[PDB]
Write a protein that binds this ligand. Structure first.
Ligand SMILES: [K+]
Ligand SMILES: [K+]
Ligand SMILES: [K+]
Ligand SMILES: [K+]
Ligand SMILES: [K+]
Ligand SMILES: [K+]
Ligand SMILES: [K+]
Ligand SMILES: [K+]
Ligand SMILES: [K+]
Ligand SMILES: [K+]
Ligand SMILES: [K+]
Ligand SMILES: [K+]
Ligand SMILES: [Mg+2]
Ligand SMILES: [Mg+2]
Ligand SMILES: [Mg+2]
Ligand SMILES: [Mg+2]
Ligand SMILES: [Mg+2]
Ligand SMILES: [Mg+2]
Ligand SMILES: [Mg+2]
Ligand SMILES: [Mg+2]
Ligand SMILES: [Mg+2]
Ligand SMILES: [Mg+2]
Ligand SMILES: [Mg+2]
Ligand SMILES: [Mg+2]
Ligand SMILES: [Mg+2]
Ligand SMILES: [Mg+2]
Ligand SMILES: [Mg+2]
Ligand SMILES: [Mg+2]
Lengths: 73, 119, 88, 101
RNA sequence: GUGGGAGAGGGUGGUGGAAUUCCCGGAGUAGCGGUGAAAUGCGCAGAUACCGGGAGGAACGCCGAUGGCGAAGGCAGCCACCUGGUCCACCCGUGACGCUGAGGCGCGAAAGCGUGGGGAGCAAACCGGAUUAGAUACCCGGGUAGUCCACGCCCUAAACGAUGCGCGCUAGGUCUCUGGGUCUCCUGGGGGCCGAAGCUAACGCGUUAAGCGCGCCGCCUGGGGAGUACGGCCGCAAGGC
């Protein structure tokens, strides 16, 4: 039932608040810009809840996509 | 009468009528079809079959406009969204890439009574 | 809003003795501080109803201590009302 | 006096003079709003996710500052006036929360 | 008091993107739309589909939950400011300062009223198209109020947990939100699920009681007549108590 690794264990000592580390945040977005479900970012209620606002900030500095297109359909 | 050989192929599939536009690599249309162009008149315009002829016809029409390969773009959830692309792979153009791009509001406009649940 | 030093300068100015922080004076002194600050914020923002509730309560609480201060020691009661400037 | 981080994204197709100009006007602004610098990270251009202002790229700044709370909104409101400055996001600084410690 | 903490709690200003709609330009040919099937409707004055540009209003996708905040009605992009509530730890200060609460006062979804302002989409009334044995209605196309904002009224509801507030007491187990800790766990405050004792007419409730108690407020006394009449009070009116 939808399984793989959690984006969490693929990273190390990382700031969940830096709206500027595009290089990392991107990982928490799907093929579409859509923000990944907890059951995949493997985060905790509070963690996830922070990563949300931290993303949407970057999404405004145009460092992260609001939305993307689905290749191979 | 010009030349292209490579371009975009949009599909505007719908629960009412699939329709295919074909354009140059810049977006400007070249030839289009649809269940309407093809004979069909009423509902029948929706059928996957319709979507077939529409796709094919549209390709055929650009085959002569001088074209060989195209990038596909899907928009909508047609009764025959798929046989619109399937008609293309079996049409005779190199389907470089098939991309989905259905427009989705980030929740904005009230829909019609029939589409309720999103004011 | 109301910061650290902001608070002391009044608890300092209102303690019955060194270290007193829950004096029925120190308490009322503080409620008033807020109460007034809150009443400024509602001078404009007259629409912010939820803030108003808090005030309505902050006031009751102040009136409640006062009420007691005046039963136990009807002197200090005068003092407080004098310093602060209450009733009118 | 609270610590704010100020972001500024502006048209990436500018020579020194123009850059130098807005860069000054921006400093020239923080001066008037009780804002004091604490460090400025100046990442040049970068590949934008979406096209901000017809452009596919943008020039970034970043300003660790401290200034009077009351006059933040004024500052932000004042930085946007330039037609080159196409993004201003000011933020209350805050300590890094750390997942996967 | 100090030191921490979570949060769509509230008010104000600003701002970001997706989408609809309309306008401008390119390209483009015979239909688009819509339905069970159709027609009304729009299109040769060039529509739909496609690309670039602009305007405007309204709502905030993924995150989102079985989740969070609030006294309730309710609250969901982002940022800043202004502000309320509340939880924990430390055991530091005051020393019964408490609880409830008829009147009174304030808040109160939606629809509705007044005056200005705005108006994209939706949409009562309404204009048409169909459907049926009939057409008023369900289905389709248009469309005004309204929906949106400021200020002022309106004071109702399946305003629901159909469960008034406070406190003390009475097995556990499991999931979760959020704090602290000697951090396979314990402990404090929320939110759910089973279930002891017990209660219940049954259903079910069961440390978030509908159990065992105490205080205080509201309310009930067959159905229809009827939330009607009369009288009063509030309202500009609708109409409310
Ligand atoms: K003590
Ligand atoms: K109301
Ligand atoms: K209303
Ligand atoms: K009105
Ligand atoms: K209709
Ligand atoms: K009942
Ligand atoms: K913990
Ligand atoms: K509990
Ligand atoms: K039993
Ligand atoms: K109880
Ligand atoms: K009777
Ligand atoms: K009457
Ligand atoms: Mg059709
Ligand atoms: Mg909030
Ligand atoms: Mg046009
Ligand atoms: Mg005609
Ligand atoms: Mg003609
Ligand atoms: Mg033309
Ligand atoms: Mg307009
Ligand atoms: Mg909930
Ligand atoms: Mg609550
Ligand atoms: Mg607060
Ligand atoms: Mg003593
Ligand atoms: Mg009006
Ligand atoms: Mg309509
Ligand atoms: Mg049970
Ligand atoms: Mg009777
Ligand atoms: Mg009635």
């Amino acid at each position: 039932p939808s399984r793989k690794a959690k984006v969490k264990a693929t990273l190390g000592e990382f700031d969940l608040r830096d709206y500027r580390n595009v290089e990392v945040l991107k990982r928490f977005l799907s093929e579409t810009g859509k923000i990944l479900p907890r059951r995949r970012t493997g985060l905790s209620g509070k963690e996830q809840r922070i990563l949300a606002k931290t993303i949407k900030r970057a999404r405004i500095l145009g460092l992260l996509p609001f939305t993307e297109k689905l290749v191979r359909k | 009468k010009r030349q292209v050989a490579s371009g975009r192929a949009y599909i505007h599939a719908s629960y009412n009528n699939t329709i295919v536009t074909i354009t140059d690599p810049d977006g400007n249309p070249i030839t289009w079809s649809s269940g309407g162009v093809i004979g069909y008149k009423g509902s029948r315009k929706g059928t996957p079959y319709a979507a077939q002829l529409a796709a094919l016809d549209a390709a055929k029409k650009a085959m002569a406009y001088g074209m060989q390969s195209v990038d596909v773009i899907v928009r909508g959830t047609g009764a025959g969204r798929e046989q619109a692309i399937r008609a293309l792979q079996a049409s005779g153009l190199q389907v470089k890439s098939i991309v989905d791009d259905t427009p989705v509001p980030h929740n904005g406009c009230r829909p019609k009574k029939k589409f309720r649940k999103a004011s | 809003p109301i910061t650290k030093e902001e608070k002391q300068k009044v608890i300092q100015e209102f303690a019955r003795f060194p270290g007193d922080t829950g004096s029925t004076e120190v308490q009322v002194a503080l409620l008033t501080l807020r109460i007034n600050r809150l009443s400024e914020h509602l001078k404009v923002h007259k629409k912010d109803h939820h803030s108003h509730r808090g005030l309505l309560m902050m006031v009751g609480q102040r009136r409640r201590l006062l009420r007691y201060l005046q039963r136990e020691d009807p002197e200090r009661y005068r003092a407080l009302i004098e310093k602060l400037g209450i009733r009118g | 006096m609270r610590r704010y981080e100020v972001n500024i994204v502006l048209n990436p197709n500018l020579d020194q003079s123009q850059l130098a100009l807005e860069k000054e006007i921006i400093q020239r602004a923080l001066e008037n709003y009780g804002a004091r610098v604490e460090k400025v990270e100046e990442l040049g251009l970068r590949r934008l996710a979406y096209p901000i202002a017809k452009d596919p790229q943008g020039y970034f700044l970043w300003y660790q500052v401290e200034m009077p709370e009351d006059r933040v909104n004024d500052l932000a409101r004042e930085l946007r006036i330039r037609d080159n400055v196409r993004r201003v996001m000011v933020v209350k600084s805050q300590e890094p929360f750390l997942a996967n410690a």
